[PDB]
Symmetry: D2
Subunit: 207 residues, 4 copies
Amino acid sequence: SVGTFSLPALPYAYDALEPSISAQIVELHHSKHHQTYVTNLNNALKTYSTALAANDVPSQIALQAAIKFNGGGHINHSLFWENLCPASSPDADPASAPELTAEIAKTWGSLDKFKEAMGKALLGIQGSGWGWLVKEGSGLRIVTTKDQDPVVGGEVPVFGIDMWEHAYYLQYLNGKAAYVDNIWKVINWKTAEQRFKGDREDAFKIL
Amino acid sequence: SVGTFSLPALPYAYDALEPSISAQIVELHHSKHHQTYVTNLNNALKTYSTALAANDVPSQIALQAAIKFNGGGHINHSLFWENLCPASSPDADPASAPELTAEIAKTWGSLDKFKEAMGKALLGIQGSGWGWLVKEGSGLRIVTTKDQDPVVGGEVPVFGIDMWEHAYYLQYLNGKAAYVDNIWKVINWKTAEQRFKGDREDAFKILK
Amino acid sequence: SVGTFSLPALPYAYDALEPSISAQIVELHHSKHHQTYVTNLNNALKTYSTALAANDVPSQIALQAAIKFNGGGHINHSLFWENLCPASSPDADPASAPELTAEIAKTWGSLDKFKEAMGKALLGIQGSGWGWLVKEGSGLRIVTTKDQDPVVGGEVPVFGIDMWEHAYYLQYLNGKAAYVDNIWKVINWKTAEQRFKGDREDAFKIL
Amino acid sequence: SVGTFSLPALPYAYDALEPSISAQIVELHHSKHHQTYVTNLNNALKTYSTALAANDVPSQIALQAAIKFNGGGHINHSLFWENLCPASSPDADPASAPELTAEIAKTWGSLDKFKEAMGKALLGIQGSGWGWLVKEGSGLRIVTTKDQDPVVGGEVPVFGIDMWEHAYYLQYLNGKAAYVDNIWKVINWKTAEQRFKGDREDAFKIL
Ligand SMILES: [Mn+2]
Ligand SMILES: [Mn+2]
Ligand SMILES: [Mn+2]
Ligand SMILES: [Mn+2]
């Protein structure tokens, strides 16, 4: 049965990521923005199934933008909620990710140096997009994606940070640097460790 | 003197576009977002001048993104402020644009049908971008641009509407459709008419 | 039966477009290049069908490039063969396209001015791509597409000219301007007229 | 003095790369294609100089495509000629690159596995473009670039392979796989080794 995705439940209350991310943002981001991606993804997929059966290639290609945008939106936000957690949770302690943080230190020198590099990448995004820590081969890389484009080229997403203005604007206004500075407090390193130790299939099973 | 752009004071109060666009949005949009494009444009242009004089092509190519993004940011927002005005102004009455609205009607059937088409294009933008009515040849077209990419390919911008989330989110949240419905109330048709009757360089005089 | 596309028969012999386009090129272009797009399209669709039925969105998005590229390749070349014909055919006479040429003249002033504009667009393409005359609304526009991107966004393709180097290089070498000058002699205006008078679905019926 | 680039002399005769790349191709590729990038780059830079002094930003943005395409064209081909050499030369033996090949083996397992991965990347390019082995940080990566886009983002080019159809079509026709198989015979590993050991600036000193 094509196109039966549903909006996943949050692992925490809307206000659980405060003070880094306000309850108003988490509620809008999940119940409105993510909801819209799920809904529009299901509709595009059913329409695609029709075109595919009719061997209608122009319609299939014309539907790709909706499927990438809403499918990517669903993929990215689903990953996002799971790699966030309350700042007071032990999951927010990078000690929860011994293997990943060891490789981060191996690659950037230290967790702090990595955070600086990641922050630069996030703040350098022009327009809407995401920043990701990914596993490529056996190594780690910082990559950015445009709009709702997902990391589907083969790399394993370890964690993502949303840099769309709706992710921060109500609370931080134009101050995206402050959003980035504060989001580190609510990164779920237990999730990141899990993804780092598993393969691409493992990371996407939550969908 | 390379890279000496400045942001002119807005010709109306921050709250002058209410209730279509809130005072907080206009203030942030102009004094923070647009100024930042101006600052970073000037910085990129000066770095570029060094690279140009040195025939350093790798650095020039590496700087293109900053110049297009910030240069486009300054161009687009400069056009935007000039094609917005208070809802109570006679300039917001489409009767201020007889020649343009006649061509709009000839093209889309009516101004109403044009607004619906334009709205569909604006709401269809994925991510950040702008929607434009442009003059191409002698005809009119609706086009969209991504991020801060400007309309510099030869067509004449007639007016633009910003669909970046910072353009509406504080007031409308995710409700971008209401933003688009309401922005028609504060479109400066006098400005649109002037641009419609002039050429591409005439439109970009706003950058002087 | 997903992915059962076949290479369409040419409407003429391989040498029918001489001297504008050599027999060698027509043979390679059809039997190798277009064929490879068809084969790889079928392969992509079979893989996509699996991902779709399985609601595997990451795989679907990863497959989009192959479907757009090969699907677009199939669409574009299918249109191309049908809007070419022998130079001696009455179909190559623009008098075969009265309604289209009338609209062309209204838009660019004359057929010659249109050809000059189209030529500039074709020669201005960086890398691989196509130039198209399209109908959008009741009006005409010249558009270019990159690689094998097809005109599937809603406008009606009227005719296309391939600017990939494989379309001309064996015969014209780097001299693409000469290729463009000569291809006007073999444009099937009868086909162009038919597309101009019909709708978007009508144009894609050849598939 | 803005825009005074010149077409570099080849390090060998036009026929020196046979049988892998024909004399006809090397001569056309260098004397026509590369020459045109140089000339159009110089002209664009001189025009840019005017627009820059006039603080004419629309004109500057409009000129970017020409500067990236022709500038990238000049950069890429300049690197290309230097990382090619006669097949009978010991410089074409990977033993000429002990440090680089050691790092390749560490990364892909073996030189053969690297060649397979590189070939896959090269053959996977849609449209016109280049494949590169680059050094980013301390590691090696295979990347592809579209059209004439250069590797200018910070990574150090180690060697490049041109996958534009003009690089092979006269000799290999549609057989890009055969082109890739055969180009390994004329890769200059001595040059590759030098670039691998050197700086980003050092690699571009060739300009
Ligand atoms: Mn988001
Ligand atoms: Mn804006
Ligand atoms: Mn072709
Ligand atoms: Mn080349």
